[PDB]
Amino acid sequence: SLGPQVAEGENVFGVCHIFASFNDTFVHVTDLSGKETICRVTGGMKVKADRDESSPYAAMLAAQDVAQRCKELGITALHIKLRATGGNRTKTPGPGAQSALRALARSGMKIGRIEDVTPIPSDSTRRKGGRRGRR
RNA sequence: GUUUUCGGAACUGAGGCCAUGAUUAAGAGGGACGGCCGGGGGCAUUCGUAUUGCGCCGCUAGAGGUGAAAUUCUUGGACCGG
């Protein structure tokens, strides 16, 4: 759990793919290449009920865990790349993604880039649902 | 008997003369011609993420889904990331 860079010299970069659906939120801290992930905590693994898994409360400690999980490695600065469900389905991020990065910015994680990596299509297939829709 | 002037019909030649014979170009149409215009058509071609699937790589206990749940997938490594 040792980083070769000195702490007061600069800040080591990381990246967390904040993915929030409308039933769960994923906080996935990976490396910059994205090929060597560090840890990935969800929103339903911190609440013992399917109700509050997309809730702001289940994601405001899910950053209090994954930041603690990455303080000892030498990492203090991250990128955040928002991504909703996307595809043919909805594109607005889940409600806890607001409270997700607000939790860790107060939990002690420095902030670098903020961007959107939603899977917006050129043109998807026929979206799930009847022609009359979810009536 | 006959041919005629004589009256009719019929054919043809040289003609003469006519004020010698054709309204207009529909704020109707057709066709041309011109520069263009357009998600008109047909054939061919080229692209785009997404979805899904498969292989590898990562790290994992849940993931999906729901007003709420469960059916379902999941240490046989799903989900999530490359």
UniProtKB/Swiss-Prot annotation:
Its main location: cytoplasm. Coiled coil: none annotated. Pfam families: Ribosomal_S11. Residues 116-135 are annotated as: Disordered. Residues 127-135 have a biased composition (Basic residues). The modification Phosphoserine is found at S1, S124. It is found in: Cytoplasm; Nucleus, Nucleolus. The modification Phosphothreonine is found at T118. InterPro entries: Ribosomal_uS11, Ribosomal_uS11_CS, Ribosomal_uS11_sf. Keywords: Cytoplasm, Isopeptide bond, Nucleus, Phosphoprotein, Ribonucleoprotein, Ribosomal protein, Ubl conjugation. One of its GO terms (cellular component) is small ribosomal subunit. GO terms for molecular function: structural constituent of ribosome. Component of the small ribosomal subunit. Part of the small subunit (SSU) processome, composed of more than 70 proteins and the RNA chaperone small nucleolar RNA (snoRNA) U3. Component of the small ribosomal subunit. The ribosome is a large ribonucleoprotein complex responsible for the synthesis of proteins in the cell. Part of the small subunit (SSU) processome, first precursor of the small eukaryotic ribosomal subunit. During the assembly of the SSU processome in the nucleolus, many ribosome biogenesis factors, an RNA chaperone and ribosomal proteins associate with the nascent pre-rRNA and work in concert to generate RNA folding, modifications, rearrangements and cleavage as well as targeted degradation of pre-ribosomal RNA by the RNA exosome. Belongs to the universal ribosomal protein uS11 family. This is Small ribosomal subunit protein uS11. The gene is RPS14.
